[PDB]
Coordinates of N, CA, C and O in Angstrom, one line a residue:
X1 N -12.4 8.8 60.2 CA -11.4 8.3 60.9 C -10.9 9.1 62.1 O -9.6 9.3 62.5
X2 N -11.8 9.9 62.9 CA -11.7 10.7 64.0 C -12.4 12.2 63.6 O -13.3 12.3 62.8
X3 N -11.7 13.3 63.9 CA -12.2 14.6 63.7 C -13.4 14.9 64.4 O -14.5 14.3 64.3
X4 N -13.5 16.0 65.2 CA -14.7 16.6 65.9 C -15.3 17.7 65.3 O -16.7 17.7 64.8
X5 N -14.7 18.7 64.7 CA -14.9 19.9 64.2 C -14.4 20.2 62.7 O -14.1 19.4 62.1
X6 N -14.7 21.4 62.2 CA -14.2 22.0 61.0 C -14.7 21.2 59.7 O -14.2 21.6 58.5
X7 N -16.0 20.4 59.7 CA -16.6 19.8 58.7 C -16.6 20.3 57.3 O -16.4 19.5 56.4
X8 N -16.8 21.5 57.2 CA -17.1 22.1 55.9 C -17.4 23.8 56.0 O -16.7 24.5 55.4
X9 N -18.3 24.1 56.9 CA -18.8 25.4 57.4 C -19.2 26.2 56.2 O -18.5 27.1 55.8
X10 N -20.5 26.1 55.6 CA -20.9 26.9 54.6 C -22.5 27.3 55.0 O -23.4 26.5 54.7
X11 N -22.7 28.5 55.7 CA -24.1 28.8 56.2 C -24.9 29.3 55.4 O -24.9 28.9 54.1
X12 N -25.9 30.3 55.6 CA -26.9 30.9 54.6 C -27.7 32.0 55.5 O -27.0 33.1 55.5
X13 N -28.5 31.8 56.3 CA -29.3 32.8 57.0 C -29.0 32.9 58.5 O -28.2 32.1 58.9
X14 N -29.8 33.8 59.1 CA -29.7 33.9 60.7 C -29.6 32.6 61.5 O -28.7 32.1 61.9
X15 N -30.7 31.8 61.3 CA -31.0 30.5 61.8 C -29.8 29.5 61.6 O -29.1 29.0 62.7
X16 N -29.5 29.5 60.3 CA -28.3 28.6 59.9 C -27.0 28.9 60.6 O -26.6 28.2 61.4
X17 N -26.5 30.1 60.5 CA -25.3 30.7 61.0 C -25.2 30.7 62.8 O -24.6 30.0 63.2
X18 N -26.4 31.3 63.2 CA -26.6 31.6 64.6 C -26.6 30.1 65.3 O -25.8 29.9 66.3
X19 N -27.3 29.1 64.9 CA -27.3 27.7 65.3 C -26.1 26.9 65.2 O -25.6 26.3 66.2
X20 N -25.2 27.1 64.1 CA -23.9 26.7 63.8 C -23.0 27.0 64.8 O -22.4 26.5 65.6
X21 N -23.2 28.5 65.2 CA -22.5 29.2 66.2 C -22.8 28.6 67.6 O -21.9 28.1 68.2
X22 N -24.1 28.3 67.9 CA -24.7 28.0 69.1 C -24.1 26.5 69.4 O -23.5 26.0 70.5
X23 N -24.4 25.7 68.4 CA -23.8 24.1 68.5 C -22.4 24.2 68.6 O -22.0 23.7 69.8
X24 N -21.6 24.8 67.9 CA -20.0 24.8 68.1 C -19.5 25.3 69.3 O -18.4 25.0 69.9
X25 N -20.3 26.2 70.0 CA -20.1 26.7 71.5 C -20.4 25.7 72.5 O -19.5 25.2 73.1
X26 N -21.8 25.5 72.5 CA -22.4 24.7 73.5 C -21.9 23.2 73.6 O -21.7 22.7 74.6
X27 N -21.5 22.7 72.3 CA -20.9 21.4 72.2 C -19.5 21.3 72.8 O -19.0 20.1 73.1
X28 N -18.8 22.4 73.0 CA -17.6 22.5 73.5 C -16.7 23.3 72.5 O -16.4 22.9 71.4
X29 N -16.8 24.7 72.7 CA -16.1 25.7 72.0 C -14.8 25.3 71.1 O -13.8 25.0 71.5
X30 N -15.3 24.9 69.9 CA -14.3 24.5 68.9 C -14.5 25.0 67.3 O -13.6 25.7 66.8
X31 N -15.8 24.7 66.8 CA -16.1 25.3 65.5 C -16.4 24.1 64.4 O -15.6 23.6 63.7
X32 N -17.7 23.7 64.5 CA -18.2 22.7 63.6 C -18.8 23.1 62.1 O -18.8 24.4 62.0
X33 N -19.3 22.2 61.5 CA -19.8 22.5 60.1 C -21.5 22.5 60.1 O -22.0 21.9 61.0
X34 N -22.1 22.8 58.9 CA -23.6 23.0 58.8 C -24.2 21.3 58.9 O -24.9 21.1 59.7
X35 N -23.5 20.4 58.2 CA -23.6 18.8 58.4 C -23.2 18.5 59.8 O -23.5 17.3 60.1
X36 N -22.8 19.4 60.6 CA -22.3 19.0 62.0 C -21.3 17.8 62.2 O -20.5 17.8 61.1
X37 N -21.2 17.2 63.2 CA -20.4 15.9 63.3 C -21.4 14.7 63.2 O -21.2 13.6 63.3
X38 N -22.8 14.8 62.8 CA -23.9 14.1 62.8 C -24.3 13.1 63.9 O -25.0 12.2 63.8
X39 N -23.2 13.1 64.8 CA -23.3 12.2 66.2 C -23.5 13.0 67.4 O -24.6 13.3 67.8
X40 N -22.5 13.5 67.9 CA -22.2 14.3 69.1 C -23.4 15.4 69.6 O -23.8 15.6 70.7
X41 N -23.8 16.2 68.5 CA -24.8 17.3 68.6 C -26.0 16.9 69.2 O -26.8 17.5 70.0
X42 N -26.5 15.5 69.1 CA -27.6 14.8 69.6 C -27.5 14.6 71.2 O -28.2 15.1 71.9
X43 N -26.3 14.1 71.4 CA -25.7 13.8 72.8 C -26.8 12.8 73.6 O -27.7 13.6 74.3
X44 N -26.5 11.7 73.9 CA -27.2 10.5 74.7 C -27.1 10.9 76.2 O -26.5 10.0 77.0
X45 N -27.3 12.1 76.7 CA -27.0 12.7 78.1 C -27.9 13.9 78.1 O -28.9 14.1 77.5
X46 N -27.4 15.0 79.1 CA -28.0 16.2 79.3 C -28.2 17.0 77.8 O -29.1 17.9 77.8
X47 N -27.5 16.7 76.8 CA -27.5 17.4 75.5 C -29.0 17.3 75.0 O -29.5 18.3 74.7
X48 N -29.6 16.1 74.9 CA -31.0 16.0 74.5 C -31.9 16.9 75.1 O -32.6 17.5 74.4
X49 N -31.8 17.0 76.5 CA -32.5 18.0 77.3 C -32.2 19.5 76.9 O -33.1 20.3 76.6
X50 N -30.9 19.8 77.0 CA -30.6 21.2 76.9 C -30.9 21.5 75.3 O -31.5 22.7 75.1
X51 N -30.7 20.8 74.3 CA -31.2 21.1 72.9 C -32.9 21.0 72.8 O -33.2 22.0 72.2
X52 N -33.5 20.1 73.4 CA -34.9 20.1 73.6 C -35.6 21.6 74.1 O -36.4 22.1 73.4
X53 N -34.9 22.2 75.1 CA -35.1 23.7 75.6 C -35.0 24.6 74.5 O -35.9 25.4 74.3
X54 N -33.9 24.5 73.7 CA -33.7 25.3 72.4 C -34.7 25.1 71.5 O -35.4 26.0 70.9
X55 N -34.9 23.8 71.2 CA -35.9 23.4 70.1 C -37.4 23.7 70.5 O -38.4 23.8 69.7
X56 N -37.6 23.9 71.8 CA -38.9 24.6 72.3 C -38.9 26.1 72.0 O -39.2 26.4 70.9
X57 N -38.0 26.8 72.8 CA -38.0 28.3 72.7 C -37.8 29.0 71.4 O -38.2 30.0 71.0
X58 N -36.6 28.4 70.5 CA -36.1 29.0 69.4 C -36.5 28.4 68.1 O -36.4 28.9 67.0
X59 N -37.0 27.0 68.3 CA -37.4 26.2 66.9 C -38.8 26.1 67.1 O -39.3 25.7 66.0
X60 N -39.5 26.2 68.2 CA -41.0 25.9 68.3 C -41.6 24.8 68.0 O -42.9 24.5 68.2
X61 N -40.8 23.7 67.6 CA -41.3 22.4 67.3 C -40.9 21.4 68.3 O -41.5 20.2 68.3
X62 N -40.2 21.8 69.5 CA -39.9 21.1 70.7 C -39.9 19.5 70.6 O -40.1 18.7 71.5
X63 N -39.1 19.0 69.6 CA -38.8 17.5 69.5 C -37.4 16.9 69.7 O -36.4 17.1 69.0
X64 N -37.1 16.5 71.0 CA -35.8 16.1 71.5 C -35.5 14.6 70.9 O -36.3 13.8 70.4
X65 N -34.2 14.5 70.7 CA -33.5 13.4 69.9 C -33.9 13.1 68.5 O -33.0 13.3 67.5
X66 N -35.2 13.3 68.0 CA -35.8 13.4 66.8 C -35.0 14.1 65.8 O -34.2 13.8 65.0
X67 N -35.4 15.6 66.1 CA -34.6 16.5 65.2 C -33.1 16.7 65.2 O -32.5 16.8 64.2
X68 N -32.6 16.1 66.3 CA -31.1 16.0 66.6 C -30.4 15.0 65.8 O -29.4 15.1 65.4
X69 N -31.0 13.7 65.6 CA -30.5 12.4 65.0 C -30.9 12.4 63.5 O -30.3 11.9 62.6
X70 N -32.4 12.5 63.4 CA -32.9 12.4 62.0 C -32.6 13.7 61.1 O -32.6 13.6 59.9
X71 N -32.4 14.8 61.8 CA -32.0 16.2 61.1 C -30.7 16.6 61.7 O -30.4 17.8 62.2
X72 N -29.6 15.9 61.8 CA -28.3 16.0 62.4 C -27.2 17.1 61.8 O -26.1 17.1 61.7
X73 N -28.0 18.1 61.1 CA -27.3 19.1 60.3 C -28.4 20.3 60.3 O -29.5 20.3 60.1
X74 N -27.7 21.5 60.4 CA -28.4 22.8 60.5 C -29.1 23.1 59.2 O -30.1 23.7 59.2
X75 N -28.8 22.5 58.0 CA -29.4 22.7 56.7 C -30.9 21.9 56.9 O -31.9 22.9 56.7
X76 N -31.0 20.9 57.5 CA -32.4 20.3 57.5 C -33.1 20.9 58.8 O -34.3 21.2 58.7
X77 N -32.3 21.2 59.9 CA -32.8 22.0 61.1 C -33.4 23.2 60.7 O -34.7 23.4 60.8
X78 N -32.8 24.2 59.9 CA -33.3 25.4 59.3 C -34.6 25.2 58.3 O -35.7 25.7 58.8
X79 N -34.6 24.1 57.6 CA -35.8 23.8 56.9 C -36.9 23.3 57.5 O -38.1 23.4 57.0
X80 N -36.7 22.7 58.7 CA -37.8 22.4 59.5 C -38.3 23.7 60.5 O -39.4 23.5 61.1
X81 N -37.6 24.6 60.8 CA -38.0 25.7 61.5 C -38.1 27.2 61.0 O -39.1 27.9 61.4
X82 N -37.2 27.4 60.0 CA -37.3 28.7 59.2 C -38.0 28.5 57.9 O -37.3 28.8 56.6
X83 N -39.1 27.7 57.7 CA -39.7 27.2 56.4 C -41.2 27.0 56.7 O -42.2 27.8 56.1
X84 N -41.6 26.0 57.6 CA -42.9 25.8 58.0 C -43.2 26.3 59.4 O -44.3 26.7 59.8
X85 N -42.2 26.3 60.3 CA -42.1 26.9 61.6 C -43.2 26.4 62.8 O -43.5 27.0 63.6

């Protein structure tokens, strides 16, 4: 019924914590959870492009919107990038 940030916040490794940091900063300096807000992190604007750039260079799987909405949580994001890579 509202709320943008402070979802839970229980990280794990570098990718987990660092991307949670990157997300909470880039999304608008606030502080989100691992589960994210499962909506806004995808972002139906420049967000998809900016995230795609990161998903290229840092994730190496380079899939805009798909990893953003189908994996709208750093838990699933980490398992996609720091597992099979």
